[PDB]
Amino acid sequence: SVSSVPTKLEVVAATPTSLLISWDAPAVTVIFYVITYGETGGNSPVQEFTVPGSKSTATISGLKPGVDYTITVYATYYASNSGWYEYGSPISINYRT
Amino acid sequence: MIKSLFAVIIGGSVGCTLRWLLSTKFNSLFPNLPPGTLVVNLLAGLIIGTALAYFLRQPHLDPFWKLMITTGLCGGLSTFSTFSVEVFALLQAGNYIWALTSVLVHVIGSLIMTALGFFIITILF
Ligand SMILES: [F-]
Ligand SMILES: [F-]
Ligand SMILES: [F-]
Ligand code: NA
């Protein structure tokens, strides 16, 4: 009944090199989303940025063509039930450019 | 004034525990205007209005009880810091319409309740 995880995370447009992802926001009040991505192997470090909680999309750039990436989004949200902010559990996907 | 200290502590503890129960059990139900936080502020308005009016009619009531009910119970039950954060968070989330609604409903709500509490006892005498 409480929604703190985004749902339906997907790549909606793509270059070989860049991605437009959207997700569906959860119920709760999100102050920002955290976006994380990196090569599914483990071969390169992992990159991370945030998006304002008002936004339910993000772009990802400078990826390598033809490589499998793992993309992850989680909400930093206000848990009204406890009285502090919380880093929500993430939703994740794989995508090959 | 240790007798007074005990009144603020016993009353405040009761207030804070009530806030806690109501806030945890209900705030998730509607997170744009958490119902638990709203209800404690509304209820503490109701309580304090009726108590204030009642104390005007009982001018020999020990300040111990008055202290327990106002500074302790109602003061521990109601919350500004929680309300402010909720609103702040909605600002952070860019949700301006509910940020605004939340302050209207908390301030105007609590005034209506304090007045209703005070006047339903004033009409009763
Ligand atoms: F109040
Ligand atoms: F405050
Ligand atoms: F609020
Ligand atoms: Na308080």
Rounded to whole angstroms, the Cα distance separating B99 from B41 reads: 17
Give the best residue of A4, A33, A80, A84 to mutate against chain B (max B CB count within 10 A): A80
For residues A80 and B86, the answer to whether their CB atoms sit within 8 Å is: yes
Rounded to whole angstroms, the Cα distance separating A14 from A1 reads: 33
* Domain boundaries of chain B, sorted by first residue: 1-125
For residues B78 and B111, the answer to whether their CB atoms sit within 8 Å is: no
Contacts of B97 in chain A (CB under 8 A): none
Which region holds residue A83: left if phi is over 0, alpha if psi is between -120 and 50, else beta?
Answer: left
B75 is in an annotated binding site: yes
Structural domain that includes position A16: 1-97
Q: How many CA atoms lie within 13 A of B37 on its CB side?
A: 27
For residues A67 and A97, the answer to whether their CB atoms sit within 8 Å is: yes
Longest Cα–Cα distance of chain B, Å, equals 51
Longest Cα–Cα distance of chain A, Å, equals 44
Give me the residues near ligand 3 (ion), CB cutoff below 5 Å: B 83, 86, 102
Which region holds residue B94: left if phi is over 0, alpha if psi is between -120 and 50, else beta?
Answer: left
Q: What was the experiment behind these coordinates?
A: X-ray
Q: What is the CA radius of gyration of chain B?
A: 16
Give the best residue of B21, B28, B37, B88 to mutate against chain A (max A CB count within 10 A): B28
| Residue A63 per-residue DSSP state | P
Inspect the interface and report whether the beta carbons of A54 and B94 lie closer than 8 Å: yes
Contacts of B93 in chain A (CB under 8 A): 29-31, 52-54
3-class secondary structure, B8: helix
| Tokens read off for B82 | 């929680």
Q: What string of DSSP letters covers A6-46?
A: -EEEEEEEE-SS-EEEEEEPPSSEEEEEEEEEEETTS-S--
Rounded to whole angstroms, the Cα distance separating A72 from A69 reads: 10
Please give the distance, rounded to the nearest whole angstrom, from the Cα atom of residue B72 to the centre of ligand 1. Answer: 13
Overall number of domains in chain A: 1
Q: A22: exposed, middle or buried (C-beta count within 10 Å: 0-12, 13-18, 19+)?
A: middle
Q: How many residues does chain A have?
A: 97
Closest CA to B36 of B94, B82, B89: B82
CB crowding B101-112: b at 16 or more within 10 Å, else e? ebeeebeeebee
Query: What distance, in Å, lies between the first and last C-alpha atoms of chain A?
Result: 35
Q: Residue A47 is part of a domain; what is its CATH number?
A: 2.60.40.10
Contacts of B45 (CB under 8 A, 6+ apart): B78, B109, B110, B111, B112, B113, B114, B117
| Tokens read off for B87 | 């609103």
Inspect the interface and report whether the beta carbons of A27 and B31 lie closer than 8 Å: yes
Which resolution in angstroms does this entry have? 3.0
Contacts of B36 in chain A (CB under 8 A): 80-81
Q: Which residues face A17 on adjacent strands?
A: none
3-class secondary structure, B6: helix
